[PDB]
Amino acid sequence: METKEIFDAAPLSVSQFLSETGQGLYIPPYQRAYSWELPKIRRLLSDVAHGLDQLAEFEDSICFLGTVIALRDINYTTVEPKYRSQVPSKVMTIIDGQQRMTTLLLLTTVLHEEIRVRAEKLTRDDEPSVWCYNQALDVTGRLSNCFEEDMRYGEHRYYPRLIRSYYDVWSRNKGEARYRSPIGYYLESYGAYARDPDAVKPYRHVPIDPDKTDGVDLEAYRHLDRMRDQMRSMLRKAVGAGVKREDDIQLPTGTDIGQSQNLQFALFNSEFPPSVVEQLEDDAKMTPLTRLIVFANYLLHRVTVAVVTAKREDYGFDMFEALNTTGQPLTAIETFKPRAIKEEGLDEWQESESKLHFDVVEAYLDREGSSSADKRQTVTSSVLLPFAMFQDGTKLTKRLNDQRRYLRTVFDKDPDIVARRKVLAGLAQVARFYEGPWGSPTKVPSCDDATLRTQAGIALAALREGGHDIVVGLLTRYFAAHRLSSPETVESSARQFLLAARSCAAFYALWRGSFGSTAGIDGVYRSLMTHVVEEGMPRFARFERDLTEVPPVEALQSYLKEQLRSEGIYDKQQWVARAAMTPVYQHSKPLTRLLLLAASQNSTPDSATPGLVVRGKSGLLETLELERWNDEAFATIEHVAPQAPSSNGSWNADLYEDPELINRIGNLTLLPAVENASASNRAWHLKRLMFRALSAATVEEAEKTLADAEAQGLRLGSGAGEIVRQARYLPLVAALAQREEEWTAEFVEARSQRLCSLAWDALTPWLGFEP
Amino acid sequence: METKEIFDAAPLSVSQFLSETGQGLYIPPYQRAYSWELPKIRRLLSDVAHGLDQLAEFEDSICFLGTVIALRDINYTTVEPKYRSQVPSKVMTIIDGQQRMTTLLLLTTVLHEEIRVRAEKLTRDDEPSVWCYNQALDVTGRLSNCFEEDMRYGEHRYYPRLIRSYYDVWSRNKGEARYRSPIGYYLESYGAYARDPDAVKPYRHVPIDPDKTDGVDLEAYRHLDRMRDQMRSMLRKAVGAGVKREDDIQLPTGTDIGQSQNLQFALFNSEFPPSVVEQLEDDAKMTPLTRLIVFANYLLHRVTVAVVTAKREDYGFDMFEALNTTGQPLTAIETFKPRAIKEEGLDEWQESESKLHFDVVEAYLDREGSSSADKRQTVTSSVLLPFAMFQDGTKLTKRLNDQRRYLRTVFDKDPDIVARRKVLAGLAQVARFYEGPWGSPTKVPSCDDATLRTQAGIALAALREGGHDIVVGLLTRYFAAHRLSSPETVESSARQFLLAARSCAAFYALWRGSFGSTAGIDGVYRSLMTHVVEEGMPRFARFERDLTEVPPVEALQSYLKEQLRSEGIYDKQQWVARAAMTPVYQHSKPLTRLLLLAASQNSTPDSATPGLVVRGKSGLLETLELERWNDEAFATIEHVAPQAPSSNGSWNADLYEDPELINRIGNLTLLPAVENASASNRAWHLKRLMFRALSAATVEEAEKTLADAEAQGLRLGSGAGEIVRQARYLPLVAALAQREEEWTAEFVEARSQRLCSLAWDALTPWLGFEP
Amino acid sequence: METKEIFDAAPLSVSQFLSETGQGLYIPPYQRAYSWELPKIRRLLSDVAHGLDQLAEFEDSICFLGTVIALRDINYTTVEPKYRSQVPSKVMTIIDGQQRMTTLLLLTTVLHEEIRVRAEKLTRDDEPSVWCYNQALDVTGRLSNCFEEDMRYGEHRYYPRLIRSYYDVWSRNKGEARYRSPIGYYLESYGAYARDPDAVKPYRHVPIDPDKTDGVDLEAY
Secondary structure (H helix, E strand, C coil): CCCCCCCCEEEEEHHHHHCCCCEEEECCCCCCCCCCCHHHHHHHHHHHHHHHHHHCCCCCCCEEEEEEEEEEECCCCCCCCCCHHHCCCEEEEEEECHHHHHHHHHHHHHHHHHHHHHHHCCCCCCCHHHHHHHHHHHHHHHHHHHHCEECCCCCCCEECCCCCCCCCECCCCCCCCECCCHHHHHHHHHHHHHCCCCCCCCCCCCCCCCCCCCCCCCHHHHHHHHHHHHHHHHHHHHCCCCCCCCCCCCCCCHHHHHHCHHHHHHHHCCCCCHHHHHHHHCCCCCHHHHHHHHHHHHHHHHEEEEEEEECCHHHHHHHHHHHHCCCCCCCCCCCCCHHHHCCCCCCCCCCCCHHHHHHHHHHHHHHHCCCCCHHHHHHHHHHHHHHHHHHCCCCCCCCHHHHHHHHHHHHCCCCCCCCHHHHHHHHHHHHHHHHCCCCCHHHCCCCCCCHHHHHHHHHHHHHHCCCCCCCHHHHHHHHHHHHCCCCCCHHHHHHHHHHHHHHHHHHHHHHHHHCCCCCCHHHHHHHHHHCECCCCCCECCCCCCCCCCCCCCCHHHHHHHHHHCCCCCCCHHHHHHHHHCCCCCCCCHHHHHHHHHHHCCCCEECCCCCCCEECCCCCCCCCCCHHHHCCCCEEEEEECCCCCCCCCCCCCHHHCCCCCHHHCHHHEEEEECCCCCCCCCCCCCHHHHHHHHCCCCCHHHHHHHHHHHHCCCCCCCCCCCCCCCCCCCCHHHHHHHCCCCCCCHHHHHHHHHHHHHHHHHHHHHHCCCCC | CCCCCCCCEEEEEHHHHHCCCCEEEECCCCCCCCCCCHHHHHHHHHHHHHHHHHHHHCCCCCEEEEEEEEEEECCCCCCCCCCHHHCCCEEEEEEECHHHHHHHHHHHHHHHHHHHHHHHCCCCCCCHHHHHHHHHHHHHHHHHHHHCEECCCCCCCEECCCCCCCCCECCCCCCCCECCCHHHHHHHHHHHHHCCCCCCCCCCCCCCCCCCCCCCCCHHHHHHHHHHHHHHHHHHHHHCCCCCCCCCCCCCCHHHHHHCHHHHHHHHCCCCCHHHHHHHHCCCCCHHHHHHHHHHHHHHHHEEEEEEEECCHHHHHHHHHHHCCCCCCCCCCCCCCHHHHCCCCCCCCCCCCHHHHHHHHHHHHHHHCCCCCHHHHHHHHHHHHHHHHHCCCCCCCCCHHHHHHHHHHHHCCCCCCCCHHHHHHHHHHHHHHHHCCCCCHHHCCCCCCCHHHHHHHHHHHHHHCCCCCCCHHHHHHHHHHHHCCCHHHHHHHHHHHHHHHHHHHHHHHHHHHHCCCCCCHHHHHHHHHHCECCCCCCECCCCCCCCCCCCCCCHHHHHHHHHHCCCCCCCHHHHHHHHHCCCCCCCCHHHHHHHHHHHCCCEEECCCCCCCEEECCCCCCCCCCHHHHCCCCCCCEEECCCCCCCCCCCCCHHHHCCCCHHHCHHHEEECCCCCCCCCCCCCCCHHHHHHHHCCCCCHHHHHHHHHHHHHHCCCCCCCCCCCCCCCCCCHHHHHHHCCCCCCCHHHHHHHHHHHHHHHHHHHHHHHCCCC | CCCCCCCCCCCCCHHHHHCCCCEEEECCCCCCCCCCCHHHHHHHHHHHHHHHHHHHHCCCCCCCCCCCEEEEECCCCCCCCCCHHHCCCEEEEEEECHHHHHHHHHHHHHHHHHHHHHHHCCCCCCCHHHHHHHHHHHHHHHHHHHHCEECCCCCCCEECCCCCCCCCECCCCCCCCECCCHHHHHHHHHHHHHCCCCCCCCCCCCCCCCCCCCCCCCCCC
């Protein structure tokens, strides 16, 4: 008694784990039911998909799936409703991890359904098509004996795996066999489905309780069934169309597969028939099935769970405990520092370039992290992704091994120094960018042009608030050249950077103004960072090369525009067309602020149409100034027509047949002081009056109209907020106090039209428009 | 490539892990330096000491210590400054666990020190003495080759384990060998001390840097050296004197050891010679050493860590990642539910006694737990420790295996059912007690006697605030009888319960008033729960028996009283002597609230001496009513002489010779309105004025003295908080407005003495005092 | 129960096999005495030397020595005259192979003798020479803790490995520890000579029976 077995860990691929010929996986009776919300599931599938995608590159890369701790129950003392007559030969009651295992078996069930049914749609007279049909049969059977097992006689001839105590008893006989737990029932039913002769229709699923089985929640069944069916949807979509939304699950493509020898060997122990790398090089109807199968094989033979087997249950619980207490992992920077300590040059580093860069990055990390441990990792991810765009042009993930591996890769391309310490200079500079223009945007750079300073400054303060980090790459790329330049070209730099900032915010405003979402834009900037620019001179996001150089000032503008063509559209007519019909408040509130502030650039109330606005005062009160973003003068996005009229305070239901009406430009302005807290709002009249309050050009109308509105009750909440003698000029609220008639739906349409047009005119000079 | 090594897991006793003959433990260069604060170290030692204590019971209980994940560096690619000539043959660079491992090596160093020097004090002419001296030699050597290792020639002929990269190079040659990290240096130097002939003094230690080695923080050395010497002090105290503070580290005593066969086999492969168990039964100069030796051998051979070995570093990182994702363990209650499902009777439970109890306990858990996952286990602990009092009379520990084991033990004593399902009825009642008089005390039970209701109600609200849960056993024990009673003896029960509550508040008030701490009280309440009371009639804390019956109503009082003798002291004289000299504001503030509210029970300002108080108005305004605990009339503890007078607001330093003065009753009362937030305090005059303010028996003293004090300034902070026209009667504050002279230390003694006298008078009737 | 241990095999260098820090090798009481005529010994050395010579060429060339089958006697039921007080912590009763094992232990004893006494002939002042002396110390010790093991106190503080039942009781105490079987006594006596300070004379060897130990044959000795 010292190691007297105690515990017993070994690694297994999920195929060698699940499909062991005589085993039953058994959920002990104190486990909760299936929890795992769909984000945990998506992380799961995306993990294995990532490891697969990275397998083409690194031929030995193994993907991990955690631990399962189980009791090897040898006298079947834990199968609480059992028929010893024929319990399986090795039961492994799952002490911990049963959530993963449930997810896993389900994953196989959907991989099985998809690969089967797409494979019957195959033309078996095409040589590569039959190759694919055969490969499919292979993986189909190999998953089939992964989730269920052919015990050899009786009705209920097939045993699931996973089972739960109480509901579900393993047996192969005609009475006495139940499969009634969520996973128990699910696997029983799918299994019988697969064995349908003359099947080949996709899987329905007939969810349980024909009149019984209230041993669980019925909500549990709902959850498990839904979770499975969404695994099926995720995968279906991961090979299908091209809408390719930002997360989804990216596994390599037909061309990817066909041209990766190592992927072929490590998943099919053989090199592909050349007829097939041909058929795959260009989708050709069979590439989705083949991609699903490659994913299948990677799942089976290259994803591994760590299996810990205890022989006594009490040891097993103490094991679980000892494994829930296992340290505090290290950010990819910490684990990467050794690899530059060991190139600079030896261990004599302290006053040797890289030390300074690392002093920078570590300083920033200790500052903004510190507070916790995964705060420290999310800060590290924050400074690492812009860098990945910057130094390379690749989308870095938030997963540790990737960050570690990418830093290792990039650092080990140009194997010098002066060459490598430029790579580290990259990270240093992204940190430095976070310290200047993003902390408080007013630093920006120096430069004169003092309208440029606060214009690019509003660009920054808006790009911070509301997502659009994708940009931190490029802009750091340029903030770099301003601080790396011959003492003369300080001004040249400062200008390129400032203009770049403006144009990025502009393109932001247009892309998210027109579409309803950040659809491609992340990918578009990625493509920008890699695309060839001007024959052989630079490459957009510094790429080896030399950090100081590259690209110009303005190849941004021409490329972003040339893109605004394509599936972007850039004629003010086409663009304001898209943007007048997109609910901007639903999207990012800082975008709608940018749009209102750009639409009311030195603007004035319109006399021809009561409530619109127009331009023409070159510099009346110019709003695209960073000082007028923060301007808590007018800094509340107020809806004219409210979002909530639950019993209808009155209003016009023309505005609510389409629930997006209430959230377009034409329904909002920037109102000072109160939001919905001090003194605010009501129905279209009290709203008229409130706007009439703040728009008067004399105090002998200010107090007059304060009193005008106090009759119906403008002093709402107590006695009207900071509402006694406010000056201030708000062109949109002035020309909104000037409309009587009523608040029509047509009028919000025309208003959002007019507002978008003004903004477009105000901004598109920021991309330097002529395309 | 499928399990292609990847990883490789094995359990080893810390002896077989550390003292393997060719191994080097190597801390790679991205590890933090030695972190672990003393709470963690003390937890560690307690874990192993617990394992020992529980090995005495269960001869098989193995104690776990978690995981260390290490890279078997096979070509020494991570020994970052190296002399390959004699790198040790097997280095294991530690990815995770270097904190535990560092602690462990330090621990061996301290046990080696203690056992060394304590065995030199042995009279080696005595047969059990020579056994102990040898046994000491045995573990002494097995620890020695546990922390260092004998490479065989040269200066620096001895290698550490644990070494840190960058600083520290293993080698045996005369230049060229460094051990300069915190752990490296510690191990090197301690080893030299151990190998000193003609030594035998305890280890001093000469911390590092004779003028160098500033690659580190100089604080790291401080922290590590300190943690070592306090491991040493911790043990020294756990086997030495008798002060036995609340934590300490509980390891068995000579007798414990001497009479437990299984402990002797499992640590010494053999039964002790009886001469030794005899000399052990009563310390006799050799028992501390033996206790320490038993502890060290348990450390060496029965603490076992799981060692996970990877062959590539990045595999090790991904593993570490995969073992940080390891479920969320379950409360001892969840893992015990099955074992009562399978006694009721079989699986046809749903309408079966035990189901009801569990539904109750589960409801209460899901209600108050829920919010987190370890909050759920902390809720379960809150209901489990008192249940341990109630159904048995044992101190349950807050550790999981202990809770599970106790539940299995108790549930399976009287192995019928009805005996068992009564045991479960126990848990249900603890939860319901937590739902009745502890949530809001105001429910209490029913009954008339309506003074008992708010009197036991203040008893409860007082026992809840300010620790003293030790009672929850008893009272639940009683609350049961009120809900389980022949409908006639409902009133008898309700009364018993209320009186139990009062008596406990009394014994509390006295015990923490007179003594300085919860010194014995815990043992006292447990003692009552186990003692035989009246031969064969019952037993105080339900012990099987039958839930409704048992004990009386008032044997509580007699027993608690008989105990108030001994080391309790209860002659009003003795008690006031003790309690006048205990700073009660220092201990539990609710205790001082209880003592002041009992000291002003229908009390009146004293005229004979200006500022004390006297009783006698039987029902003037009686304060021991739960409606007056919360009565934020008088619910602020005001110090007369302030704790803060750093430059002397003026005041009297007679009160500051002894810092316990400022915090005795004689310096505190119950003040309405302000503490130190609205309008408050100053120097003793303004304090006079504030006490004169709220004591006014007319409004024409209210406004008069309000403005009196605004002259010096009672409106401090704004304009005197809720201070205009207050009725309100606070007898204590009147006789505080009634002392002129000055605020002396002598008078504070007098004041606390009288207040204590009064409270003693007011409360001891709650124990129905005759002893 | 299908492979439920049944058996359990693994390879070990003669170093990691013999010198396990807590092990005792025990010849059960039905084994024949030491037989092996000098030719089997000659093949033993010639094989190990051949593997050695073939290592210069192939850096992976590993040399085998056969199999030993042992029972991991866990509650000391085959140690036939025992002091449980301090039987070694892990005994392995050798079901097959005790002839190799006896040869081996003897071999380690002779290599230890030669390397020791030749190294004391070293002029420890010549740089390669001190290289050699140290190397001697390293191998010398790693053979010492190969044939015996330092249990830590008492007279007869050192245990042989290999011991034969009936004759020979492992213990570290002053009565009660016997080593009178042929190997037992040889290893014990070699061990004592190893630890003689100020020896450094080659080994003589003073064989048994000052008047006793005819529990065996005397020819085996």
